[PDB]
Amino acid sequence: MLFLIYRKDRPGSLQVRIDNYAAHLAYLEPLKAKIQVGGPTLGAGTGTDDKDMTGSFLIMEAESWDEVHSFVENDPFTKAGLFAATIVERWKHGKHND
Amino acid sequence: MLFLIYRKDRPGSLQVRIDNYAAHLAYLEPLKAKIQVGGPTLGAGTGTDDKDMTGSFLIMEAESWDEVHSFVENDPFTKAGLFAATIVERWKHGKHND
Amino acid sequence: MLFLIYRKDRPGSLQVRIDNYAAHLAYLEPLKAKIQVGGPTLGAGTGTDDKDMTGSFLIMEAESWDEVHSFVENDPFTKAGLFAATIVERWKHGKHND
Amino acid sequence: MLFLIYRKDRPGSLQVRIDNYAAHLAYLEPLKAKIQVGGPTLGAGTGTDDKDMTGSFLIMEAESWDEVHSFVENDPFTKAGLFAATIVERWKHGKHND
Numbered sequence: 004m005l006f007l008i009y010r011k012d013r014p015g016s017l018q019v020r021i022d023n024y025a026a027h028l029a030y031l032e033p034l035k036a037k038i039q040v041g042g043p044t045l046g047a048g049t050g051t052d053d054k055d056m057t058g059s060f061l062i063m064e065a066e067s068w069d070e071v072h073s074f075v076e077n078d079p080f081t082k083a084g085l086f087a088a089t090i091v092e093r094w095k096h097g098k099h100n101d
Numbered sequence: 102m103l104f105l106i107y108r109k110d111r112p113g114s115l116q117v118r119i120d121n122y123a124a125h126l127a128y129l130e131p132l133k134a135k136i137q138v139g140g141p142t143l144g145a146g147t148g149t150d151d152k153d154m155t156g157s158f159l160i161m162e163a164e165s166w167d168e169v170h171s172f173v174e175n176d177p178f179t180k181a182g183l184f185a186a187t188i189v190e191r192w193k194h195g196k197h198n199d
Numbered sequence: 200m201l202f203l204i205y206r207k208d209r210p211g212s213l214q215v216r217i218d219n220y221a222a223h224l225a226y227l228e229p230l231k232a233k234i235q236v237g238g239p240t241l242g243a244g245t246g247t248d249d250k251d252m253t254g255s256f257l258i259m260e261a262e263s264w265d266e267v268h269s270f271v272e273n274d275p276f277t278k279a280g281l282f283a284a285t286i287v288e289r290w291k292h293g294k295h296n297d
Numbered sequence: 298m299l300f301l302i303y304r305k306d307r308p309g310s311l312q313v314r315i316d317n318y319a320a321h322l323a324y325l326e327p328l329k330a331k332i333q334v335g336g337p338t339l340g341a342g343t344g345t346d347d348k349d350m351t352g353s354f355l356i357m358e359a360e361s362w363d364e365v366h367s368f369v370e371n372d373p374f375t376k377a378g379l380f381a382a383t384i385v386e387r388w389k390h391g392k393h394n395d
């Protein structure tokens with residue numbers, strides 16, 4: 004069972020993301036087996052550096068919305084108040100293929 | 102250059118999705134090389150059938166927002182008025198790995 | 200200083216909303232002076248009854264994102280795990296008028 | 298019948314908003330009777346000037362999703378490719394009051 008987890012940083016908070024980035028990745032590390040796809044959303048331009056990060060997107064396995072809820076609630080990014088938006092959706096790969 | 106393309110169906114419009122589903126997939130077919138990840142969002146429960154579809158999510162390569170804009174504008178789903186929400190974000194895979 | 204606070208219920212959770220609706224309104228009651236606009240989003244059709252509710256939208260005064268964060272975190276609806284999406288934006292009335 | 302219409306500008310496109318702002322307001326002018334609430338979302342800080350605008354939010358009367366769809370499709374802002382996100386929801390004022 005897969006979930007899309009989309010979270011967008013509040014304006015002006017890039018430094019909060021940076022300050023908590025190592026802790027965020029350490030929080031994801033034990034969960035890596037459950038994360039199918041993951042990475043930051045990016046802002047203006049073509050840059051792909053740390054300074055270009057504007058949010059977090061993951062596709063993750065979970066047994067329940069309760070599990071997803073706790074995962075989100077316990078993220079260092081969430082606890083730091085980084086995000087202005089959070090969107091979660093149950094999801095599956097298209098079964099033809101795209 | 103990758104973009105997240107998230108689109109959520111209007112309420113009560115599952116039959117519109119069904120009616121246009123073959124055309125939508127035919128529209129995606131020539132673009133398949135550019136689509137890294139793709140599939141429907143799903144609603145209540147654990148079902149993964151056609152009746153459980155509530156929207157469309159894709160991660161796709163494009164050279165420009167203009168290209169993404171046209172791709173969205175020309176989708177049979179868009180032309181049928183299926184969606185209540187559309188969210189597009191530039192994005193990259195996390196470069197450690199998750 | 201005004202914020203849009205948009206929150207959409209998880210699929211299949213209308214009964215959670217109902218179960219917590221009185222508590223939610225009681226939670227908003229002391230804050231009513233700060234809420235400029237408020238009401239539920241509605242689903243398919245033209246109905247405007249309790250059964251048609253699909254989420255919560257408010258425009259509210261706050262002195263800080265920290266205040267908004269706590270307001271959201273302490274809502275009976277949030278504690279019950281009602282929502283799949285939460286979007287917050289600083290906002291102002293257009294100064295001509297619309 | 299009321300709809301929330303939420304639209305967020307693409308990154309780096311503040312100047313597109315500025316360039317099209319007069320045309321946007323002229324497009325809204327004949328519709329003003331149908332718009333209950335309207336204004337720009339705002340970004341970082343406490344500023345409320347043109348430079349602080351990051352998107353458009355309206356609450357508007359319409360007889361149909363088809364009407365909302367056309368309204369969005371015909372906006373100078375939409376035609377200019379200003380937006381990264383568009384969210385539309387049927388909505389009503391809470392009938393106690395908040």
Ligand SMILES: O=C1C=C(O)C(=O)C=C1O
Nearest residue numbers: 097098101139140141157
């Ligand atoms: O692969 C898919 C891609 C989509 O966009 C959709 O809506 C449904 C699918 O099965």
Ligand SMILES: O=C1C=C(O)C(=O)C=C1O
Nearest residue numbers: 041042043059195196199
């Ligand atoms: O892999 C990643 C996953 C995230 O959630 C993030 O925010 C940044 C990354 O590089």
Ligand SMILES: O=C1C=C(O)C(=O)C=C1O
Nearest residue numbers: 293294297335336337353
């Ligand atoms: O009133 C307004 C309405 C809008 O849609 C906008 O973008 C800016 C404003 O000032």
Ligand SMILES: O=C1C=C(O)C(=O)C=C1O
Nearest residue numbers: 237238239255391392395
């Ligand atoms: O006024 C209201 C405010 C809310 O947040 C809600 O969910 C329902 C209502 O009727």
